[PDB]
Design a protein around this ligand. Sequence first.
Ligand code: NAD
Ligand code: NAD
Lengths: 480, 480
Amino acid sequence: PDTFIDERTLEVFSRALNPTNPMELRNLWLGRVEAELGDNALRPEYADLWRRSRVRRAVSVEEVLRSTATVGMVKELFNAFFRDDLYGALSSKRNIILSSGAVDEDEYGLPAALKETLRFALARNFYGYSDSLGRQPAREAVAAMESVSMQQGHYEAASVALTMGATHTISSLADFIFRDNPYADAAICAIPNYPPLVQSIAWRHPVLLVPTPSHGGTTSLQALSRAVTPNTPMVLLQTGTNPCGSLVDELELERFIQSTSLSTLIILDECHEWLGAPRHFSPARQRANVIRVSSLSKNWSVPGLKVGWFLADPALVSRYYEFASTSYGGPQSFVYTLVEVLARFERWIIEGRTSIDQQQLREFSASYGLQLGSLSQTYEHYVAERRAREQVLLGLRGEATSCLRRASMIVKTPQCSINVFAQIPGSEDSYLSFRNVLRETGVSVYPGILSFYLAGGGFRVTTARKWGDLHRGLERLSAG
Amino acid sequence: PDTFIDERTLEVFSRALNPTNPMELRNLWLGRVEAELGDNALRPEYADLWRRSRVRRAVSVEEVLRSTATVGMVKELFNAFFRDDLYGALSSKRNIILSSGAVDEDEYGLPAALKETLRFALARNFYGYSDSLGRQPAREAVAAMESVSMQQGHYEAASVALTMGATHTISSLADFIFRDNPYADAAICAIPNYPPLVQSIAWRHPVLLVPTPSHGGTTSLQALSRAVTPNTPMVLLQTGTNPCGSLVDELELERFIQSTSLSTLIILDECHEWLGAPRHFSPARQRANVIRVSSLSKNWSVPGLKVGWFLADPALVSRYYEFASTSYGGPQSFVYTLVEVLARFERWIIEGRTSIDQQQLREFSASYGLQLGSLSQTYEHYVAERRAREQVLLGLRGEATSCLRRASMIVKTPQCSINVFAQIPGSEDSYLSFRNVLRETGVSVYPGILSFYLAGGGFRVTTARKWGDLHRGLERLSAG
Ligand SMILES: NC(=O)c1ccc[n+]([C@@H]2O[C@H](COP(=O)([O-])OP(=O)(O)OC[C@H]3O[C@@H](n4cnc5c(N)ncnc54)[C@H](O)[C@@H]3O)[C@@H](O)[C@H]2O)c1
Ligand SMILES: NC(=O)c1ccc[n+]([C@@H]2O[C@H](COP(=O)([O-])OP(=O)(O)OC[C@H]3O[C@@H](n4cnc5c(N)ncnc54)[C@H](O)[C@@H]3O)[C@@H](O)[C@H]2O)c1
């Protein structure tokens, strides 16, 4: 069963001088981890700090999940992991990085059809000022793409707002939602989640953390449904769960969505709902209080392009126009052609189209100068490249699951995305396991504490790497 | 003399039902403008609303400049200008756009050397996750570029934080500064300014508007210096003033900077300090409380790329790392090569280098595969392209000033940037002049009310357009 918090987590919060301070909590958490590393402690200053700590209060489970310091402490550990541990003191060229959580851009990158649209925008000087919500033909293409996946209903361009990635989208949404929001109940964030997203929400409003366990690759929203109140301002939930790779059932999601008041905005993080997800969305996903956020960083492996959008009610998108104009002025006009081509190519794939006639070419404008022969060949090669990428990534995920289970390690079966969650038997600290595995085997893994797994010793393994690196990393994981 | 506010501005605020409401103020301002348009009123609903309004309070000059509704009203007029008037109801393909305020990307675009670095990043798949403050070699190049322009002192890579444009930078800075800022005095924004920047600051803290008049192309900070208090949280000021094109004297800026306490952060908007500006910065610009914000949107004419950075104290940049990671995760990794090449090319130009030896090539890494022959030719052609662009833009600005003065219109002589501020004699409303000029001549101009010129009827004319469009626009301006 999934473990989210236990008595070991409460020990750090109980000995803190100031439990509200996120820096003191991070130092104690790092101090305890480095105390177990007797002769292998990287920073002995924190190890002595934990030794001198003394229990001075009683901490309950409810206190930890309702504290903004818990989100802050995890985010500080998130910061210390990258710039202080993985790419800082312990940075090495001989390390095998299995903790990135992103698809290898050099091996599995953007398709050549989509890279051609970026060179086309460069040649046409398509990098001027544009609308705050995005160019209108780009939004129209996105709406058509999202409509064919719905069981019933369609989407309009007034429901689409292009943004600069999912991290910026949710951060922008939280600031926009909590301007003068009358509802004073704590915002609900479902864990496991992404610390940058949770910390951004904790910036504006107090946050309640609700565990969302998974059983057999199925994400359970039973605990989430009970915690949601009629006065809840917002809810952040992943349809495809990270790091375990579990997936939310459509009927359970539909029942949970329909059981909430219209004043409770539901943010659906759909960045991991791919590579095995049956994307047949119920009409409840188009409810007035539902906001669907997606990004190109994982599915198309372009995190450095900062391209994304969200779907909401047309009245909400109209209000967001004023926020986007002031906050950043508008999205990237350089990638408007890429978004329009991506949305129309994906929509044709869902409809099962194999060849392109004059009807599909007429969807694009005449200013592009598209030809029937060139567009048809481009789309067919795009389909083959996307299907090939899906099969290789599925094979790597399955191969990693079997190889890592052969090393007598408890592994949860993934249902979507590119991540596999595993745990060495007898491990109780996820950050300590990262330090131990990196020192002995030389492979870096993503600790579960960075995924809001306050308890347990499981870690995330990213299987969407080059086969040469992935095989070597798995080989030393079994040997170690 | 410059007029910022008068009795005509106070009339709108006095008749408002709710003076705090920005929408009511915008409707009255638009209603009065459309009341003068007897048979030419675009929306007669607002014209009747102004007629029925009655005076119900007394409004002073100090009340208008200390109200967040004044910033909101101007920003609503900013929104109504673009999506409701220029590109909405009155949108037409026969209109000549002289109100964009940006360099024509199709005619005067990014240099081919800088466009080659974007195609290089595409081929090398340089669109992955990166540091929250930017890639280290990119920041090192920027610091070297900024150091050669200083009269004394140098910059380090710890003082550089890459961001996604100036609008996003100032919006991010305002949120970062006002997290738990103890100083409760009103933030000071110098007008004329950019409504998106002022509205973003008004989001976090109350704002005081301080007029910053110009005389003979010289921006006067005498009024700004008196308004600044030891408890002032932040000050937003443009070194190159928009729309008039005036410039701040270096000695006056140095005296103003050195006369402020270290607790008053000074944001220097330097996006218009080019095309005639003597960029010889005093050491006071490197003070611990000074933040220098720049962008590539105007000087390099790439607003759609969202590329920029700011310079601050190394201690402030370190704290900003946590904010950038949560707010948006980090800057655009796709443009890292462009930033590094831009910064090193500009630094060589300032030093007066004409040829490239092995010493300059060694500054770049060996992973780029740069050759001595190719790099030297690329830099020399980049210098010629940048110098050619400067001369044509200067000629268009000078030609527009003389031709538009020949039409018996009061024109302020510009000292920098690409904008020229003019006023038809007898005009008292800037927005009305925009409606009248667009209806008769067919040329669109940028009203001064959108530049926080609450009084007067002057408008901004953008001279950085194609000569065919600029000449036709000037010809119908004189005829009309
Ligand atoms: N000019 C300003 O200072 C300013 C400021 C704020 C908002 N705006 C917004 O600018 C918009 C201007 O729109 P528009 O009439 O240029 O049309 P548009 O919205 O179709 O295109 C705007 C710009 O997007 C870029 N672009 C990128 N990919 C493109 C593609 N495939 N096809 C066409 N353009 C592409 C080009 O630079 C183009 O000029 C308005 O909606 C306005 O509200 C302008
Ligand atoms: N992987 C993650 O999920 C994640 C999350 C948060 C932060 N980070 C940050 O990612 C960084 C990774 O740095 P790194 O070791 O890859 O080195 P780096 O910082 O030099 O390069 C990072 C990435 O930038 C891109 N890039 C763009 N232009 C480039 C150029 N000219 N040369 C090289 N790369 C270029 C590439 O995708 C490259 O892999 C760390 O600083 C880390 O803190 C990673």
